[PDB]
């Protein structure tokens, strides 16, 4: 499991801090570019999230489609390929993953832009990659796709790890049965424990916690006589209420600065993980890796990618 | 060799025009330069901000409120400017971490692509990787990955193995392909058919076990020489 | 700011209210990213459409067919 | 697989390598050449 993106948040720095108060907005303007710099940084990390998904999934120039006459030499990819029966094109393991991750509402100032690629499009891209690695082996990742019968493709993959071809064909039934059993076992393996999807759910929870802490900060006062600006303007005349308003301004802006710094750090971390996911998508599924532990415990054969909410799920 | 040389020369030529014509080719470096210059400018521009004081000019504070009270305005300005410098330094630290990650990736690319040949299928551009050349850039490095992209594929009908006197022959390197009536063995990445021989193949097991075998005769180069000397 | 309140070119999307760009039933590649899988492009007009993820290509497949190249092309790629 | 001169290559005399052990290695060419010449 690898996370690739987090919710694209944005905050109206001026509107958030001053809370519709026009005079407070006029006072805050004296600070200069703080409210522009924060918005710019949030936008910058917001765009990067689309970049991460486009880098991880859009590895293929065309959308391949698996053949109708399914005769993959006894291998049964039913649990991995897309399911026509569902209203969405999601595959059964993809459906289980989408169910296993659960919740960012409307607030004051905050907004969550939708991702550039919807779940349907990402599932379509993953189906394209899956059909490509099923019918065409590894060629389609480095040129025009060349069809090759799947049992022969697996026979050549064995030849890539030092086991001669004839060990596969003479054991094709056993290989097929083991592969089908493992693929079928992945579903109940994921369904077994809520801790299986720890990374993606942890990413969502951390984002929600940061957002809640940012919103909850409004109830504080930072040494002012009250938390609501209207009360400040009611109690004192402007020459004296200006100090209280400045106090609230510094407090709220410090809170927003802390939130933005946290988001920048988390953006760097998640972008590192998205680059790792892109490397794995490029190397494992599109090809084969001689990196003895980069793609699962053991000698490596082709993998299959699967889309998950805010991440990927590889079947090494 | 002639065709490879002509294609390589044409590509190394066309890359120059590709860089020249496109106005946004080098965006990854211009982004760094623009971000650094913009951060510095917005730092300096913040110097003239007020931060809630009677003035933004330092000396004016020293000549308009007297030492007993101008210290408060001075302190407010001090806190504002120090906070702005804090934000600039933190942004610089995060961006420097990002550039360090990029530079480590570039170092790995240099070591693997330029100094050797990398089997990582999509680490060095589309297609199988042959070699690469580095080129210096004002704040980065520009590679020229030279990749082998196959083209002009065509259909063939194969079998996983060849049966001949009941012994399951397999290809030593490559894959059996048929043009419709005959059979041939070929390297897996280029169509150079060669007549099937006991040296081009190897044997194991026997007929009944493999799933897609076909019937054909396998040449034996020792037989003609032996029959020549009876 | 009453400008661009015309009703002849007011559109609604999951990404938000979109004004001026005329919606089309066709599909193309990415030109300008609106949110939620809609992209806007120029043509004597501006259009906004749902993304196309690359032309569909189906590989002819069977249990006994292969395809091996008969030629190569060298190429150079910057990074 | 039974040892043959086809899946085995030759280097040097029998002394220089430690752990060397004696055995026969079948030849897929000698019987037929002897049979037919
Ligand atoms: C491939 O695996 C799928 C598993 O999804 C098999 O589908 C099952 O088929 C049996 C018998 O037809 C049904 O009773 C089950 O309800 C199906 N689903 C599951 C989840 O078990 C399928 O039969 C297998 N074989 C082929 C050729 O597709
Ligand atoms: C290699 O191991 C596999 C199991 O990993 C063996 O397959 C099992 O064989 C037994 C007895 O024939 C069956 O009862 C099981 O149902 C088989 N399991 C599977 C998943 O196929 C296989 O027989 C072993 N090979 C040899 C030569 O003994
Ligand atoms: C398939 O390959 C066979 C190779 O034997 C071709 O048959 C040969 O064609 C050449 C054409 O000049 C003749 O000179 C040879 O005499 C043929 N072989 C024999 C044994 O007669 C055949 O033409 C090829 N067919 C296709 C469709 O590619
Ligand atoms: C590939 O699939 C085809 C069709 O499903 C198989 O063709 C059948 O093969 C059997 C055994 O040789 C014949 O008895 C039938 O008459 C064939 N039917 C048709 C419609 O061709 C073929 O055997 C399969 N080959 C492999 C290697 O799986
Ligand atoms: C490939 O050749 C084998 C051997 O010549 C064929 O198997 C024979 O088929 C005939 C059919 O009348 C039987 O009488 C023999 O007993 C079979 N011999 C053996 C050893 O199986 C086989 O049918 C051929 N297959 C194809 C597709 O040509
Ligand atoms: C492989 O492709 C190259 C082009 O990429 C072909 O080279 C061309 O060949 C024709 C006919 O001889 C010439 O008129 C062109 O000038 C060649 N182009 C270049 C760039 O040299 C080559 O013929 C192809 N190989 C095969 C076997 O068809
Ligand atoms: C393996 O073969 C070698 C070579 O024939 C043997 O070495 C000879 O052993 C005899 C034993 O009586 C000595 O008299 C010879 O001097 C040895 N050398 C030569 C060149 O003949 C060796 O003994 C055999 N056995 C083992 C276990 O190595
Ligand atoms: C193989 O033949 C089929 C059917 O004629 C065709 O659709 C396919 O394009 C051919 N293969 C290639 C690589 O063109
Ligand atoms: C476009 O598609 C929609 C939905 O299928 C349909 O209602 C409409 O008539 C089509 N044509 C135009 C011009 O909108
Ligand atoms: C090491 O191998 C040699 C023969 O190759 C043998 O004589 C010796 O006993 C071995 N040593 C040990 C500790 O097994």
How would you describe the overall organization of this protein?
In chain A, the strands form two sheets. In chain A, strands 1-6-5 form a three-stranded antiparallel beta sheet, sandwiched between helices. In chain A, strand 5 (304-308) and strand 6 form a beta hairpin. Chain A has 316 residues and is mainly alpha-helical. Chain A is built from eleven helices and six strands. Chains in contact: A-B, A-C, B-C, B-D. The A-C interface holds A 50, 58, 60-67, 69, 71, 73, 113-118, 120-121, 124-125, 128, 131-132, 135-136, 140, 143-149, 151-152 and C 14-15, 33, 35-37, 51, 53-69. Bound molecules: a molecule of 2 linked components (NAG-NAG) (7 copies) and 2-acetamido-2-deoxy-beta-D-glucopyranose (3 copies). A molecule of 2 linked components (NAG-NAG) binds at residues 174, 177-178, 181 of chain A. One 2-acetamido-2-deoxy-beta-D-glucopyranose binds next to strand 2 of chain B. The PDB classes it as viral protein/immune system.
Helices and strands in order:
This is part of a larger assembly, with four copies of chain A.
Chain A: E1 2-3, E2 8-11, H1 13-18, H2 22-28, H3 34-57, E3 63-64, H4 92-100, E4 110-113, H5 119-135, H6 150-160, H7 166-169, H8 172-192, H9 198-216, H10 229-235, H11 238-285, E5 304-308, E6 311-315
Antiparallel strand pairs in A: 1-6, 2-4, 5-6
Helix pairs in contact in A: 3-11, 4-8, 9-11, 10-11
Bound molecules: a molecule of 2 linked components (NAG-NAG) (7 copies) and 2-acetamido-2-deoxy-beta-D-glucopyranose (NAG) (3 copies).
């Amino acid at each position: 499991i690898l996370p690739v993106s987090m919710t694209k948040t944005s905050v109206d720095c001026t509107m958030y801090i001053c809370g519709d108060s026009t005079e407070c907005s006029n006072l805050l303007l004296q600070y200069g570019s703080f409210c522009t710099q924060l918005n710019r940084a949030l936008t910058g990390i917001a765009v990067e999230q689309d970049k991460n998904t486009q880098e991880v999934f859009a590895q293929v120039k065309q959308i391949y489609k698996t053949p109708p006459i399914k005769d993959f030499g006894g291998f049964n990819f039913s649990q991995i390929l897309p399911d026509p029966s569902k209203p969405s094109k999601r595959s059964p393991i993809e459906d289980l993953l989408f169910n296993k991750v659960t919740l960012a509402q409307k607030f004051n100032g905050l907004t969550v832009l939708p991702p550039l690629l919807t779940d349907e499009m990402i599932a379509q891209y993953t189906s394209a990659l899956l059909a490509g690695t099923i019918t065409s082996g590894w060629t389609f990742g480095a040129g025009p796709a060349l069809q090759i019968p799947f049992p022969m493709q697996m026979a050549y993959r064995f030849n890539g790890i030092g086991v001669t071809q004839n060990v596969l064909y003479e054991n094709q039934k056993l290989i097929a049965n083991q592969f089908n059993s493992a693929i079928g076992k992945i579903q109940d393996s994921l369904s077994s424990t809520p801790s299986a999807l720890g990374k993606l759910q942890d990413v969502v929870n951390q984002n929600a916690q940061a957002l809640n802490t940012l919103v909850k900060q409004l109830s504080s006062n930072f040494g002012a006589i009250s938390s609501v600006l209207n009360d400040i303007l009611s109690r004192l005349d402007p020459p004296e209420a200006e100090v209280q308003i400045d106090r609230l301004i510094t407090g709220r802006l410090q809170s927003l600065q802390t939130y933005v710094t946290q988001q920048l750090i988390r953006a760097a971390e998640i972008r590192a993980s998205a680059n790792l996911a892109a490397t794995k998508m490029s190397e494992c599924v599109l090809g084969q890796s001689k990196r003895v532990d980069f793609c699962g415990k053991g000698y490596h054969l082709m993998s299959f990618p699967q889309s998950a909410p805010h991440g990927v799920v590889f079947l090494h | 060799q002639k065709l490879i040389a002509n294609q390589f020369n044409s590509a190394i030529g066309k890359i120059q025009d590709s860089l020249s014509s496109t106005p946004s080719a080098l965006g990854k470096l211009q982004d760094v330069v623009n971000q650094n210059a913009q951060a510095l400018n917005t730092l300096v521009k913040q110097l003239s901000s007020n931060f809630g004081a009677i003035s933004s000019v330092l000396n004016d504070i020293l000549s308009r409120l007297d030492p007993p009270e101008a210290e408060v305005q001075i302190d407010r300005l001090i806190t504002g400017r120090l906070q702005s410098l804090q934000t600039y330094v933190t942004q610089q630290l995060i961006r420097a971490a990002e550039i360090r990650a990029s530079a480590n990736l570039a170092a790995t690319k240099m070591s693997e692509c330029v100094l050797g040949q990398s089997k990582r299928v999509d680490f060095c551009g589309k297609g199988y990787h042959l070699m690469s050349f580095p080129q210096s850039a004002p704040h980065g490095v520009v590679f020229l990955h030279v990749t082998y992209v196959p083209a002009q594929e065509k259909n063939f009908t194969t079998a996983p193995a060849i049966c001949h006197d009941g012994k399951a022959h397999f290809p030593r390197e490559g894959v059996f392909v048929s043009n419709g009536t005959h059979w041939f063995v070929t390297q897996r990445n280029f169509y150079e058919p060669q007549i099937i021989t006991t040296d081009n193949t190897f044997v194991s097991g026997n007929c009944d076990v493999v799933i897609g075998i076909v019937n054909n005769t396998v040449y034996d180069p020792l037989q003609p020489e032996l029959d020549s000397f009876k | 700011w009453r400008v661009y309140s015309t009703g002849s070119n007011v559109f609604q999307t999951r990404a938000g209210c979109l004004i001026g760009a005329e919606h089309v039933n066709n599909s193309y590649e990415c030109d300008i990213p609106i949110g939620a899988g809609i992209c806007a492009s120029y043509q004597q007009s501006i259009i906004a459409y749902t993304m196309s993820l690359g032309a569909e290509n189906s590989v002819a497949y069977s249990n006994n067919s292969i395809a091996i190249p008969t030629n190569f092309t060298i190429s150079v790629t910057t990074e």
